[PDB]
Amino acid sequence: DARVGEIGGVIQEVMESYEVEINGKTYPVKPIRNLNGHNILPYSIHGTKSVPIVKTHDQTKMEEGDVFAIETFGSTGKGYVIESGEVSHYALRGDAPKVDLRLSSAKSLLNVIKRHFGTLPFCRRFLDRLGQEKYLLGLNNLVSNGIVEDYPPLVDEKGSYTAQFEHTILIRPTVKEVISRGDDY
């Protein structure tokens, strides 16, 4: 029965009460407003629900049986990230449209991905260890055709510092179980 938009406001108010001196200048810590946690589904890292880290009017409620990844990010910069840099991360869309590919090279990679990774995310090095050496043409073609999604690195402004903490929690029928808790954090 907790309201996700109200949770976001509480998270923001605690973090924003802190400040940090770097090279003689004091910087307020700002939430990265366009990042959020999410629910987790079988074999699929992102579901349909979001957990913001600023106050919003999202009234969607958490329900018995759900599992959520609660993650927060703080920054000394603008509190906003953009995509920039070399791409390493990819994932096959489960809802990919049916397409016909003239290039035979793509036809082979598509079979490899479904049979090895399914909808689980993969990286370039996971292809190298399977003996794939001439795949960059086909991978870029699968992205352009809407079959594979790319996830470029996300960066704040140069000279800023960012930190992250995240846990997985199970909303069981009886009690809440914070499954990833350890003695470290």
Binding site: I82, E83, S84, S144, N145, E157
Partner: protein
């Protein structure tokens, strides 16, 4: 072009540019005095 594009890349260059500060310099005369200095350089 099903992809159409991606709006994430807005503001890439301005964000990643290095930041450098103003360095203090002497104040310049203003008003009638500033015109007097200009006249001397261009004709004397």
């Amino acid at each position: 072009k099903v992809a159409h594009g991606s709006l994430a890349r807005a503001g890439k260059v301005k964000s990643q540019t290095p930041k450098v500060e103003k360095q203090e310099k002497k104040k310049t005369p203003k008003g009638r005095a500033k015109k007097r200095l200009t006249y001397t350089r261009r004709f004397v």
